[PDB]
Structure formats: C-alpha cells, structure tokens
Design a protein around this ligand. Structure first.
Ligand SMILES: CCCCCCCC/C=C\CCCCCCCC(=O)OC[C@H](COP(=O)(O)OCCN)OC(=O)CCCCCCC/C=C\CCCCCCCC
Ligand SMILES: CCCCCCCC/C=C\CCCCCCCC(=O)OC[C@H](COP(=O)(O)OCCN)OC(=O)CCCCCCC/C=C\CCCCCCCC
Ligand SMILES: CCCCCCCC/C=C\CCCCCCCC(=O)OC[C@H](COP(=O)(O)OCCN)OC(=O)CCCCCCC/C=C\CCCCCCCC
Ligand SMILES: CCCCCCCC/C=C\CCCCCCCC(=O)OC[C@H](COP(=O)(O)OCCN)OC(=O)CCCCCCC/C=C\CCCCCCCC
Ligand SMILES: CCCCCCCC/C=C\CCCCCCCC(=O)OC[C@H](COP(=O)(O)OCCN)OC(=O)CCCCCCC/C=C\CCCCCCCC
Ligand SMILES: CCCCCCCC/C=C\CCCCCCCC(=O)OC[C@H](COP(=O)(O)OCCN)OC(=O)CCCCCCC/C=C\CCCCCCCC
Ligand SMILES: CCCCCCCC/C=C\CCCCCCCC(=O)OC[C@H](COP(=O)(O)OCCN)OC(=O)CCCCCCC/C=C\CCCCCCCC
Ligand SMILES: CCCCCCCC/C=C\CCCCCCCC(=O)OC[C@H](COP(=O)(O)OCCN)OC(=O)CCCCCCC/C=C\CCCCCCCC
Ligand SMILES: CCCCCCCC/C=C\CCCCCCCC(=O)OC[C@H](COP(=O)(O)OCCN)OC(=O)CCCCCCC/C=C\CCCCCCCC
Ligand SMILES: [Cl-]
Ligand SMILES: [Cl-]
Ligand SMILES: [Cl-]
Lengths: 312, 312, 312, 312, 312
C-alpha cells in the first residue's frame, strides 16, 4: 500500500532468484524461446514485525492484497508474464518471503557464423523502477538459482545457468533503475547433420567427378547437369531452416564453393569436346589427365582454408 | 480459508484420480500432446462435520469459496490448466468430495530409435506444496482412474492408463512436496508406412540395379542418375516429418546405406566403360557378371544385420 | 440458486434444441470441424409461478444470472464453448424459457475407405450431471432443431441434421448423467477430383506405355524413367493431402498398382533389349507384340476388380 | 441506466453507419477475413434532456457507463467483436453521437471461378436486440457510412461501400425484425498474374512444340518429356499462390487442356517415328507438316471457346 | 474529477513521448509489427498545488483513479494497448508527470517494389479524446522520444525514430485535429542475397549459354532443357522468402526476362539444326558465331535498362 519509509536515506535491497522448470520451443527464425520457472523475492519491512510469544505463532501468511510488493518486470519479453502467487510468509523480525510461478516468451539474438557447430548464450533481464520516496536495488541469492534435471531443449545441450552478481544502475525517464542478467549457456547437437547432409553431398560430388574418365560428350553433360539439379534440391532443403544474416556463414561459403566447382567442371567438359572436334586429341588428353588430379586437391585445400578461417 | 489443524502430527492425505475423456494432437517434432479429462480430490476436514439426523440432510453442498481447497498443479505443462468446478459435496463425518474438468497441453520426451515400429510412454505429473503449518501428501484412488471408450489418437493405439501408487517426497525451496506419476502407454500403427514408403523404394532400387544387364553407357548413366534423383526426392519427403535426434535411427541408417549403394553402382558402371574402351572386354564382362550376384546378396545381408542390431 | 424440489420422487426434464448457422474448417488431417449455432432450453420450476391478473400487466424479458439455469456441457470439444445469452423469458405457470448462442470446435472420427466418394457422419453430444437432491434428464424439442439455409461447408454437401430422441443414461463418477446425440450427415463433391488428379495420371501412364512401338533402347529408357519421375512428383502432390490410416484406401491401392506397372514395364524393356543384342530378334518382337495388348487389358481388369472390392 | 421512455408511439430509428478503416488478412481456405473499422449509431434521444441550457452550449461528453447504448450483434462473426469506444459526444439539444473501433473475423463466402478476373463481394449482417420500449428498427444514414480511403488491402481495389435493408431468415417469433446487409465490392488487380504465370507456360509449350521441325526421335522424346516435367514443376510452383478450391476453375481447365495437348504431341511423335521406320516417309512428312499448323490453331480456338464459356 | 477550468484561458498542452523497448514480428502479409514502449505524458494543472514550507520538497504519488488523466488512443492498432500504469507524480507548481508501459501491434502499409534494395517507414498515430470544458493540444517532448539502441528487428537495420505534428483529416472528426506521427525508418540487409541468389543464377545461365560452341543437337537440347528445369527449381527456392506481392517487382521482371532468354535460345538452336540438315552450313556457322556475341551484350543492356527504369 506504501513503500517502507527509510531510516534516513538507505536504499532497499531485494534478493531475487529464478529456478527453471521447463524451457522449450527455441525458434531460430524469430530468435525466441519459451520458459516456465519460479521467481523468489525477499526484502525488509519493519511495519510487519510481531511478537512470537504474544501472538503464539512463528510465521504469518498474508494475501497479496493489503501488503506492499515491489513491481518487478522483465525487459526482453513479448508480453507480461502469466503469474500466480504461491506463498507469502513473514518472519518475526520483518523479513518477507515471496514465491511465484510464471511463464513467458523471451527475445534474444543469435549468432550463426558457425551454424552446424555453434554455441549460444541466452539472456533474461529483470528490472525494477525506483519509487520517488525510496531507492530500490536488486541482488542475487545464489542459493535459490538452478534448474531441474528433467529440463530439455529439443536439439540442444544445456551447460550452465548462472547470474551476474553486479546490477547495472542507470537513469531512465528521470528515474534510476537497476537490472540483473541471467545467462543460459547451450550448445547445438550436430550429430544428425553429418549423415543426413554432409556425406550425401560428397557422394553426389564424387559421382559428378566421374566425367573425367569418359570421352562421350552427352554422358558427361547428363551427369554434370543432373548432379547440379540434385545439389539445388539439397540447397533448398538446407536453406529452409537457416535464416538470413548480414554476415557470411560457413555453410553458405561451402555451398557457393560447390556451385563454383560445378561451373568449372562444365567449362572443362566443353573445352575438352571443342578441342577433340578440332582433331587435337593430345591437348584434350593432357587437360583431362591434369583435371583428374587437380579437382580433389584444390577442393581439399579450399576446405582446409575455410575451416581455418572460420574456426581459427 | 485455512488448512485443517493436525491432531498431533499426522500429515494430510489427499486422494486423487484422473479419468480421460479426449487425448489428441500428438506432435512428434514438438514432443507435445493435448488432453481433456476429469480431476477428483478427497480429504478430511473435521471442522465441517455435522449431525445428519438433526440437520435433515445427508450431504451438504458448498461453493469453491468459504472452504479450504488444496492447491494441485501439473508440472510438465506449458501453461496453467483451464478448469471449471463441477460439484463439491461434504460427508457428515467431514470427508470432502471434489470434482472438476480441465484441459492442458503436456510436454513429454519421445524415443525414435525404432521410428516406424516404436512404442512410447507419456507422463503426467501432479505436485502439491506443503503449508507452513501442515504437511500434505498425495495418494491414488484406484476406483476413480480410467479412460473413456471413445478416446482415440490419430495414428496410435492406446494400451493402458495407470498410475504409480508410491509418490515421491522431496524438498524444494525449503518446503516439502509430493509428486505422482500417470503413465499412458501407446504404440504406433505402422500399416500405412509399408505400401507408401518401403515398397516403392525397393522398386526404384531394382530399377537402378537393372543396369547390369546392359552395355550402353548413356542408358546406364540415365537409369542410375534418374533413380538417384527419385531417391533424393523420397528422402526429402521422409525427412520432412521425422525430427532431428542426437542418436542414430533405423530409417537414417537405411537411407545412408542406399546412398552408399548408389555411389558404388556409379563407380562400377564407370569402371566397366573404361575397361571396355581399353580393349579388355573379358574383364568388364567378368566384373559385370560378378556384380549381378554381388549387389542383392550384400543388400540382404546388410538389412539383416541392421535389423538384428536395432531390434535384437 | 437451488434445484427445484421434487413432488415425490420424479426427475426433472429439460428439452433442448440446436439451430445451425455456420459449419466450416472441416480438416481431414486433424478430423475436427468448427460450428456456429444457437441453443434453446426449457424446464419446469413450480417455485416461480404468479397470477397474471394481478402480479403484472404481462410477462417480460430479463437478463442473465437471474434464475437457476441448468448447466449443460459438450463432451467432444477441445475447449469449452464461447457463449453469449441473447434472450430469456418466464412463463406464468412456472416453466422457464432460455436461449443463447455459442461457437465451438468439435472432435469426431472420420472414415476414408472410399476417400474420393466418401460420406461421413458428425456427432455432437450434450450431457447433464445430476445433483444430489434432484435428477435431471434431457429431452429433444423437434420444433427447435434445424439448420439455416445459409449453412454450408466448403466442398461438402449437407443432407440432414437430426437428433436421436432416446437418451443414454449411465453412472459416472458416482452420479447419473443423460446424454443426447446430434447427427450431421454430409457427402463429398467429387467432380473436381477427376480432371485435377485422375486424368493426368492416366495420360502419363499412356505416355509411358507408348514405348512399346519403338526399338531404340535409349529412347525407351528416357521415356519410362522420366514418366516414373513425373509420377513420383504427382504422387507426392496428391499424398500431401490424405492422412495416414490403419486400413487400406482406394487411392493408395491405385497408386501402388501404378508403381507395380512401372516396374513391370522396365523389366519388359530390359528383357527386349537383352534378347535383341543376342541375335534373337523374333522372340523380342513377339514379346513386344504380346505386351502391347497385354498391358491395357490387365490394367482395366485390375481397376474393375478394385472397384468391385471397395464399393460392392 | 434505463432505455428512454416512450413518448408518442414513435419507433426508435437507430440510424447506423460503418466507417471502414482497415480491411486485411483475407483468408480463402476458411472464407475468413478480419476487419478493423469504425461504427456510428445516431438514434434520437430528445426527451432525455442532456442539459439543454443555452449558456451550456458546450457539447456534453459522456462515458460508456453514462447513457443507454443499443445492443447490436453480428450474425456471421466468429466471436464477439472487440468494442473500443472512441468518444460519445451528445449536443445539448438531444441528438447523440457514438464512435467505436472494433476488430472481428468475418465468415463470408468467396467464389474463385474466373479467379484472375473475379469481382468479389463481402457481407456483414447486423441485428439489434428488442427492448421494453417501442419497436427498434435499424435504419441507414448515408453521412455516417463511409471509409478512410486509405485501405491497405493489397491485391484488391475497393469499388464502393453501401448497405441494403432486409428482413431476417431465422426463427422469426416476432423477433429479428430488421437485419441490415452491408456490401463491400472489391476487384482483383490481374496485371501481375500475366507475366507471373501465363507467359512462362506459353513459352514452355512452344519449346515443346519446336519438335515438329526435327527428325531425331531421341531429341523429340527428350524435348517433349522434359518439357512435361518442367510443366509439372511449374504447376507445383503455381499451387503455392492459389487457395485450395474444391470446384472447377478457369485456371484448372487451362492446366487440364495443356496436359491433353502434351499427350497428343507424344502420340504424334510416336506415329511419325513408326511410319518412318516402316519406310513410308511421304506420309510421315505430310503428318509432320500438317501438325505445324494444326496445333496452334486448335489451341487458340479452344482458348477462345473456353473463355466464352467461362465469361458468359 | 474533471479537467481544470480555463480560468487562465490556456488550452491544455500535453507533451507526449515514446521510448521503444522491443520491436519484433514484422509481417509482410498482414503488414503488421508489434512493439513495446513507454507512453510518457506531462500536462499541467492548478489544483494539487502544494507548498514546501511544511511538506518540503515532496513528490506526491497519486492513484490512477484519484485524479484526472487525459485519454489517448492509437489510430492504426488492431486492438487496444495493454496498459501498465507505472508512476504518477505531481509537482507543487502543478505539472503532472505520467508514465505507462504498453504493448500493441501496429498496422502499416509496405511497398515491396525494388525488393532486395528497398526501404520502409513505419507509422504510429496518436490521438486524444476531446472534452467540452477545455481544449487539449498535443505536443512533442524531444527529450522523451527515443529508442533503446538494442532493437533486434531481424533482417533490418534501424536508421532513425522521430515525430511530427499533422492534422487528423478524418471525415467523422468533431474536434480531434492534433494527431501525431511517429516514423521509424529501416533498411533491408541485402548482403547475403548476392551469394545466395544472384551468382548461382548467372552460373546456370552461362552453363546454358555454353551451347553455342557445340554442334551436337541432342547435347544442345539436353543442356538447354535441363538448365530450364534447374531455373524453375531455383525459382521455387527463391519464392520461399519472396512476399506474395500482387504487382510488378524488380525480381519478377528479371525472372521473366530470364524465361524469355531461354525461349530465344531454344529457337536459335532449332534454327541452326534446321539449316545444317537442309545443307546451309555457312549460314548455320554465321548464326552460331553471331549468337555468342549477341546474347551477353543484349542481356547486359536489358539489365541496365531495367535497373534505370526501376531505380529512377
Ligand atoms: C569426410 C568428413 C566427414 C566428417 C565431417 C564432420 C566432422 C565434424 C565432427 C567434429 C566436429 C567438432 O569437433 O565439433 C566441435 C568443434 C567446436 O569448435 P568451437 O569450440 O566452436 O571452436 O567444431 C569444430 O571444431 C568444427 C571444425 C570444422 C568441421 C568441418 C567438417 C566438414 C564440413 C563439411 C566439409 C565438406 C562439405 C561437403 C558438403
Ligand atoms: C560469359 C559467357 C560464358 C560462355 C561460355 C564460355 C566458355 C566457352 C568455351 C570456350 C572454348 O571451348 O574455347 C576453346 C579454346 C580453344 O583455344 P583455340 O581458339 O583453339 O586457341 O580454349 C580456350 O580458349 C581455353 C578456355 C578459355 C575460356 C574460358 C572462359 C571463362 C569464362 C568465365 C566468365 C565469368 C564471368
Ligand atoms: C520387406 C517386405 C516387408 C516389409 C514389412 C515387414 C514388417 C511388418 C511387421 C513388423 C513387425 O512385426 O513389427 C513388430 C516388431 C516390434 O518389435 P519390438 O517389440 O519393438 O522389438 C522386440 C521384438 N521385435 O517389429 C520388428 O520386429 C521389426 C523387424 C524389422 C522389420 C523390417 C521390415 C523391412 C524394413 C525395410 C527393409 C528395406 C528398406 C527399403 C527402404 C525403406 C525406406 C524407409
Ligand atoms: C577424393 C576421393 C574421391 C575422388 C573422386 C573419385 C571419383 C571416382 C573415380 C572413378 C575411378 C575409375 C577409374 C577406372 O575406371 O580405372 C580402372 C582401372 C584401370 O586399370 P588398368 O587397365 O591397369 O589402367 O582399374 C581399376 O578398376 C582400378 C580400381 C578402380 C575402382 C576402385 C577405386 C575407386 C576410388 C573411389 C574413392 C572414393 C573415396
Ligand atoms: C532381389 C530380386 C531383384 C534383383 C534385381 C533384379 C533387377 C532386374 C532383373 C532384370 C532381368 C533381365 C533378364 C534378362 O535380360 O535376361 C533374359 C533371359 C535370357 O534367357 P536366355 O536366352 O536363356 O539367356 C541365358 C543365357 N545367356 O530370359 C528371360 O527373359 C528370363 C526372364 C527374366 C525376367 C523375369 C524375372 C524378373 C526378376 C525380378 C524379380 C523382382 C522381385
Ligand atoms: C492461356 C491463355 C489465356 C490468357 C487469358 C486471356 C484472357 C481471356 C479472358 C479475359 C476476359 O474475358 O476478360 C476479363 C476482363 C474483364 O471482363 P469481366 O468483367 O471479368 O468479364 O478483361 C480484361 O480486362 C482482361 C483483358 C486482358 C487479359
Ligand atoms: C486405353 C487407351 C490408351 C491405350 C495405350 C496407347 C499407347 C500409345 C498408342 C500409340 C499409337 C501408335 C500407333 C502407330 O504408330 O501406328 C501407326 C499406324 C500404322 O498403320 P499401318 O502402317 O497401316 O500399320 O498408322 C496410323 O497412323 C494409325 C493411327 C494410330 C494412332 C492414332 C490413334 C491413337 C489412339 C490412342 C488412344 C487414345 C484414347
Ligand atoms: C507459335 C509456335 C512456335 C513454335 C516455334 C517454331 C520455331 C521453328 C523455327 C523454324 C525454322 O527453324 O525454320 C528455319 C527457316 C529456314 O530458312 P528458309 O527455308 O530460307 O525459310 O528459317 C527461318 O524461319 C528463319 C528464322 C525465323 C524464325 C523465327 C520464329 C519465331 C517464332 C516466335 C513466335 C511466337 C512468339
Ligand atoms: C541479375 C543481375 C542483377 C545484378 C545486381 C543489381 C545491382 C544493380 C541494380 C540495383 C542497384 O543499383 O541498387 C543499389 C543499391 C541501393 O540502391 P539505392 O541507393 O536505394 O538506389 O545498393 C547497391 O549498390 C547494391 C549493389 C549490388 C551489386 C551486385 C553486383 C552483382 C555482380 C554483377
Ligand atoms: Cl513482466
Ligand atoms: Cl496447473
Ligand atoms: Cl461447453
């Protein structure tokens, strides 16, 4: 009904804590995920002190109405959280214990520079706005922060869930506010990507490379163009999931390199046929024999260079 | 309004029960399903005891307000359930009968190691938190647990719906809680998968294999590469439904094996043509006649080995 | 406020009636549909009688939440209906007149054994739970059941909308309930399926068959395999709309028959080429001449047999 | 409050009017579309003098819970509209003015015959609730009805916005005595559809038709069959724009005719090759020379006939 | 409570201000985006004037229902905003400071011409309800308006966020002529588009154009038609991210020109083969040498003309 008046000027410290229950629906395109957890609060209020001997009880229970509760809201959320108070208890000295279960959808950017083998950090921000009669700051209760063992994200491994102890005090709208930061660290499960994506593309490229052992123009044209169509289909399948980014990713570079290799192979086949028609088989044979070794070596060198550029 | 005081130290026992009406919308990728069922509660409150002879009634009817109802919550739900109270009846001795109907969306992990022929178990968890003056524990009333005869799931067969009698008692947030487990066991209907997926792939593979009785290079290239394109299309269609898993499944292994077989067939065709160009027809004929027998036997052996590995 | 007391022991009879307005969003995959209709009720309450000569000039109209209203619920609904009362009135003798409007999503199983030419029946259930002091049973008012001339589904033909007069009673949750059944009978409009699906498949099959008049191996391979690819694409397009069933459907049987025919055609072409290359042209010519007539007659006989099996 | 008392047996002529603001999200699969528009009811309330003092010439401003607002309902809506009152200004003379913004999802039939060149109409039905006072009849005020002239509905250009007074077609037990019908004429901008769809198919068809100037049977087969595959792929591409319509359409008829023409072209190629290999080159030359003129003329005549059939 | 009387004859000036917090969910079909921001208002009054003689420098926090607060509504929002009144403070001089956090989705038109390199402007319109007692003048406080500099609108980079004053220009207006316009300017990030789309199309087109250096009719036909199929597949890939735009676009014009070029190439190949068969190799060689130069130059000139036409 009214914030607790201070002694002279001291700030009011609120101890927080989040305990995860469920996290799910991590969207790569929209960069959002859904959470379901607890929220714990604690502060000091001398107006609610009591005598245990005379009252005969050691703990009091209050309804959320007719009692002062600080307004704490999240920053990076789509809407207000769906809250329902669980318990409120008061110690004889005046300490208030608060508990609540909520659910919300959080906004957090992602980095896809190493998309198949990347790790991400997810942030949840809590903020409290100071009242004009009292300054309020936040604190972290490390004993009440954690997660259940049944929590799971489909396709991700959860590593740690911590909080930054130092709040960030800044002045906004002619008022001072404090902000905490909870970080959830995850890594992507990349096992399924290898046999489903990587190896078939290598097989198709190797199949297309068999045009350097034949001298029939029509068969080479058929092989190369059909393998190109298959590559286009696989590119459609791959890009159906990865969103557009303003920077260069590993997978996009690999795909562009494959396209360039297909173009160069078509050029080589055309040159060989054109030379063969002119009754100059020696040059065509030399070019074909050179290309047979040239293509895989350059492919492996380029792959090594890209792997060092993006991961080293 | 206030929990019933204990006699000396006995905990409060609450008897539960869930009766299924409708279960539907099982999503494989999201690993969720929706429910619609009854919830029943019963406990003892001596403060509401009366004498049935004088009062003229054997059962008193109360509203949800002005009576203490324990807080029962589901653990693995995305949002708090939508429920409406049906009836509350009070026995003369003090036993309270409670009933409601709810609907909720449940999160449950799934196992896809035998995806076409797999069986799943779905879990529903009920929890209760102890108040500062009384401890509450849960119990199972076997006479009020069951499912309707009209319950159906699209694509699944429902086998049983039971509950583990023994609850789990543990401490969370400096309070004691009790949790129950309700298990729904289902198995997938795999009839539609055979003629829609399995047989056409075998037919396409045999059409690909038919190229060992020919000697024209262009025809062999056309057959093998076009069958590869058809296999790619079928693989994309299949993968559009099965989600990504951190382990290896049966279908993925089969698909990878088919890709490997196609690659080996392309290699064999190229080798035969190259040998025939160099004026060594006998070696090409021997290789072709050997491959004619080699391919199906190896395919059958690999299928048997995989079947034993995944199901035995 | 309270159920009317019985005279000696008789139950209470409530007569209902549903007037349809809109039915739409009939989904084959989810087996659900949305409805939009009115609802009318009536019952006898001797505690509300009055004398029209003196109590007032006439009878008037009132607002909701004014009189004891029986609570009726739908059984097969995903969520509780969204309603809004529109009118209510009382009779001089004591009987009460009630009305409202609702909208709900209904779950109902479907049968696809004759998918192109199938007819379905949709069920809607109303139930009432008896209170401990009075028994309530449901009745059908035939004069208030019907559908608007503006009721229409997209692609379906509505035939009738009746209600089974006889209710079904059973003891559920230690109480007696009465249930009513409303049946909506519809039929599918199959004309659009002929030129969109059926005829292109026949044209492609005939194009595949046209290869029995040529002796060039490469041309036959091209024709047959490319037509197979086209069939695969068309089949994917078709199957992207028909859900999986534990039984066999007409369309699936036809598609599997088409696949088998393609396999046999490939085998015949390979056999003809193999016989031709071994200096036995007469046998290949005889086989081709026989197949020219063999294929269409077998196709027609198989189609007739399937048509008799699935509709006889 | 209470509705105005009767004075001189004059019916309350509630003059309605809909001021469109936003029409958007036209969904065709369910015949649903949202509308964000204004409203204005201008009934006469002279008797309930709202401070007609001359010195109080200022227009009296009221809140929703200040005066009697008539209760009107929509018939073809999903759920109740979101009534957001803007302002209720009443002049001291007695004339009232009302303004609100509502959002609703409207069920209106959509006809997709003549799909590229269709002019659709949208219907909104209003009904007012009866009151204890004299009969309430809905009336149309031409100054109130209008639109913002800044509609963001892309793909359509709005012709006009009018209204027609009609009776109801429901259970008319001296109720539903006035149902207003509003009509929103719209037309589809068809210019982009020509380059987006029509011309590429004609180019593909002509590419197929180039085979009548060639003699190579393999080249003709490759041309026609690969052109058919391209046509199927382009149909797949087209299907993403059109809605799912279970009835005959001009575009579908065009597609079917294109399939038929492909079939006839394949037949002609086969006949030409058969005659040429049976050594009657004169007849083959005559047929292939006649086809060059026969095909385009028949195609154009069929197009003209179909256009006349489908456009009166 | 009522607005302060115009004793000083001063129309009430209410300085506004919006501070963006989160912007997300930009939609290209419904033309809708969601926002989270602060609504800061600062008007003046004569009542609630205090003196620091006794109370000192004391900020007086009042209740949302105790004092008068002006009513402000958005013009182009789907539903009303979700208000969370944060703080109300009154200065002894009479200045009243009001703050609120809201969430709402905004309707704003989009122009998708010059699609890969386009810019957009998002508009928010604020209006204030008028009262008879005194006028309300809306101003802009340049210190309150701003953004969080950490907005994660994916796919775009934000340029600026300012405001201006415009008249309402509404046909139903009475006294609202002080609307405000908040303009958010964004630009699409087009870097990934080049390697993802543009270069593969050029490679495919050049592979198609390699057919002017050959004389094999079958090889030329295979090259051109397979390249056309690949182009159709790549158009299918491109259509996934392209908005469904019912008017002309730069990308659409480019794609149409590509189709036209494919058609012309097919015609040229047919002409060359016809001349070679009719024994005019000089003319055939002249045409095939001219085409090698003609095609790229005409393509570049058409690209330049189209770019000038679409980009001023
Ligand atoms: C033939 C190749 C067959 C195997 C291909 C996949 C090998 C990847 C397995 C191991 C990856 C691994 O160690 O991941 C962890 C680790 C995490 O690094 P940070 O801590 O972020 O630094 O990831 C890496 O180091 C990844 C290194 C690059 C792997 C590149 C693998 C090959 C990719 C495709 C190349 C050919 C493309 C053909 C299409
Ligand atoms: C741009 C449009 C590209 C069209 C295709 C370009 C390649 C055609 C093949 C040329 C060919 O066969 O030339 C044979 C010719 C034989 O030489 P003589 O004239 O006998 O000396 O070989 C060569 O000239 C060697 C290859 C050089 C051509 C390389 C072209 C690369 C074009 C890349 C363009 C990228 C933008
Ligand atoms: C080959 C032609 C027939 C195909 C269908 C045959 C299988 C139908 C019946 C399956 C069946 O009985 O399933 C029940 C049973 C359930 O086992 P569990 O209880 O989980 O394990 C403990 C006891 N086994 O399943 C099995 O035992 C399955 C055994 C292996 C079946 C393999 C069937 C053929 C698989 C495909 C082979 C060829 C691949 C072709 C391409 C496929 C592309 C996806
Ligand atoms: C990087 C690794 C992959 C690189 C790309 C591989 C493309 C496929 C190459 C096909 C090789 C065909 C060569 C061939 O036919 O030669 C036959 C050759 C000729 O013998 P002589 O008459 O003495 O000469 O004899 C043979 O059959 C040799 C064995 C060839 C098949 C086995 C090698 C296959 C290599 C695949 C590597 C995949 C990893
Ligand atoms: C596992 C089962 C499938 C395995 C892979 C099958 C691929 C397709 C097989 C193609 C068979 C072609 C047979 C062929 O061309 O030979 C014709 C052969 C030659 O006879 P002779 O003149 O005596 O020649 C022998 C002395 N030189 O005669 C025939 O026509 C035999 C009939 C063969 C076709 C019928 C069998 C079909 C097999 C597929 C079964 C699939 C299940
Ligand atoms: C395949 C080739 C068909 C392409 C379509 C050509 C248009 C034929 C039909 C167009 C027509 O009848 O005109 C409709 C339409 C207006 O008439 P309605 O009022 O709809 O009658 O005409 C036009 O303005 C379109 C003319 C160019 C197309
Ligand atoms: C069931 C309906 C579809 C049945 C399967 C159709 C497969 C494709 C048919 C191909 C026909 C080719 C016949 C051919 O080339 O013969 C030419 C033939 C040979 O005559 P002679 O030299 O005297 O002997 O001369 C002709 O031009 C005859 C005309 C036959 C073709 C025209 C009729 C085609 C009918 C198709 C059925 C459509 C339904
Ligand atoms: C409408 C359907 C059009 C199908 C496409 C047909 C194209 C075949 C071109 C005819 C051809 O090759 O003839 C070569 C012929 C032989 O020369 P002479 O005997 O001296 O005469 O030469 C020519 O015709 C010169 C080239 C002009 C052909 C241009 C055709 C353009 C058609 C597009 C119209 C539709 C848009
Ligand atoms: C297929 C051919 C398409 C080539 C790419 C089109 C690039 C030039 C036309 C577009 C253009 O000028 O946009 C400039 C655009 C911004 O335009 P405003 O300043 O708003 O005007 O930004 C750029 O400069 C984009 C540059 C893209 C270059 C792509 C070159 C590809 C290689 C050929
Ligand atoms: Cl919040
Ligand atoms: Cl719950
Ligand atoms: Cl209900």
């Amino acid at each position: 009904v009214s914030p607790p008046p201070p002694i002279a000027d001291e700030p009011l410290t609120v101890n927080t804590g989040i305990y995860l229950i469920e996290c799910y629906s991590l969207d790569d395109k929209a960069e959002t995920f859904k959470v379901n957890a607890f929220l714990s609060l604690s502060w000091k209020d001398r107006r609610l002190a009591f005598d245990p001997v005379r009252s005969g009880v050691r703990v009091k229970t209050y309804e959320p109405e007719a009692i002062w509760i600080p307004e704490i809201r999240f920053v990076n959320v789509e809407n207000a959280r769906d809250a329902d108070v669980v318990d409120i208890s008061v110690s004889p000295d005046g300490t208030v214990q608060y508990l609540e279960r909520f659910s919300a959808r959080v906004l957090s950017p992602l980095d896809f520079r190493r998309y198949p083998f990347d790790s991400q950090t997810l942030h949840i921000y809590l903020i409290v706005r100071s009242v004009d009669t009292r300054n309020i700051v936040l604190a972290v209760d490390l004993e009440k922060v954690g997660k259940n063992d049944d929590v799971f994200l489909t396709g991700w491994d959860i590593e740690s869930f911590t909080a930054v102890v130092k709040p960030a005090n800044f002045a906004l709208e002619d008022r001072l506010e404090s902000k905490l930061d909870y970080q959830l660290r995850i890594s992507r499960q990349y096992f399924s990507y290898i046999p489903n994506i990587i190896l078939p593309m290598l097989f198709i490229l190797f199949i297309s490379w068999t045009a350097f052992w034949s001298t029939s123009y029509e068969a080479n044209v058929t092989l190369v163009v059909s393998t190109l169509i298959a590559h286009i289909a696989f590119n459609i399948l791959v890009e159906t999931n990865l969103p557009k980014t303003p920077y260069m990713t590993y997978t996009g570079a690999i795909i562009f390199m494959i396209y360039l290799f297909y173009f160069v192979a078509v050029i080589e086949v055309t040159v060989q046929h054109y030379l063969k028609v002119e009754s100059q088989p020696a040059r065509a044979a030399s070019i074909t024999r050179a290309s047979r070794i040239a293509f895989p070596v350059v492919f492996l060198l380029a792959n090594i260079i890209l792997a060092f550029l993006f991961f080293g």
